[PDB]
Design a protein around this ligand. Structure first.
Ligand code: 3WR
Length: 234
């Protein structure tokens, strides 16, 4: 996979053409050209934004942990929910929703992609019965939402993949992030309901995120404080 020249990334062929020119789904431009994303994947981008570790002098002076704002973060979440809602409409099940699979493209538009078992992202029913649906994709979207809020924190940091197989069926879920408004965590919690039919639709998630984005009130705290610590990686 190499970058060439319009900007392209030369290496699923049907998938990229058929799932149209939707702005929130990576597009197609043997050889095959994919629309180039200049900011790479969302996961590394969220981690690069952790300016307390990257530029402590700038961070401390600006009393911020992120070069990204709450408005910008929920916009990435809103983009993924929108692209996903087009996928559900097309009756397409992703099976691999993770921040590492979202590309931050031109104009900072979040684009859904699928490139390389992702236990930490999978719904209990996928882990135990290999049953994949839009409902299980909603579960993995919640873990993705959690990654956006935690600025690319590893989900279930400290717990092994094996551990999760026993801990999730008994109702264990990701804890409320410190920097997270209750309305955002409530939305993540719905994405992880044991009953697949109880989880929201992508269109509901989108509408709920648009409402927050329209508010002019901060839902994700990026402001620095004394006992401020980031969500762990590895
Ligand atoms: N900076 C970049 N700029 C452009 N491209 C990049 C990158 C990058 O940093 C890393 C990798 N890629 C890249 C690789 C493969 C692909 N291919 C794909 O995503 N195919 C694909 C989609 C879907 C769907 F997500 F659209 F549903 C389903 C099933 C699939 F095989 C896209 C993108």
């Amino acid at each position: 996979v190499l970058k060439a020249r319009m900007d392209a990334a030369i290496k699923e062929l049907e998938v990229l053409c058929k799932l149209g020119h939707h702005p929130n789904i990576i597009n197609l431009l043997l050889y095959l050209a994919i629309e180039y994303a200049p900011h790479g994947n969302l996961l590394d981008f969220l981690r690069k934004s952790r300016v307390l570790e990257t530029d402590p002098a700038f961070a401390i002076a600006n009393s911020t942990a992120s070069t990204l704002s709450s408005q910008q973060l929920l916009h990435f979440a809103a983009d993924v929910a929108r692209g996903m809602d087009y996928l559900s409409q097309k009756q397409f099940i992703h099976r691999n929703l993770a921040a590492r699979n979202i590309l931050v493209g031109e104009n900072y538009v979040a684009k859904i992609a699928d490139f390389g078992l992702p236990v930490r992202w999978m719904a209990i029913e996928s882990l135990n019965y290999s049953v994949y649906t839009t409902n299980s994709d909603v579960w993995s979207y919640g873990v993705l939402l959690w990654e956006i809020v935690s600025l690319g924190g590893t989900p279930y940091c400290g717990m092994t993949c094996a551990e999760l197989y026993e801990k999730l069926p008994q109702g264990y879920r990701l804890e409320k992030p410190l920097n997270c408004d209750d309305e955002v965590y409530d939305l993540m919690r719905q994405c992880w309901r044991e009953k697949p039919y109880e989880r929201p639709s992508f269109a509901q998630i989108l509408v709920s995120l648009n409402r927050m984005l329209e508010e002019r009130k901060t839902y994700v705290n990026t402001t620095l404080y004394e006992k401020f610590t980031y969500a762990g990686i590895d």
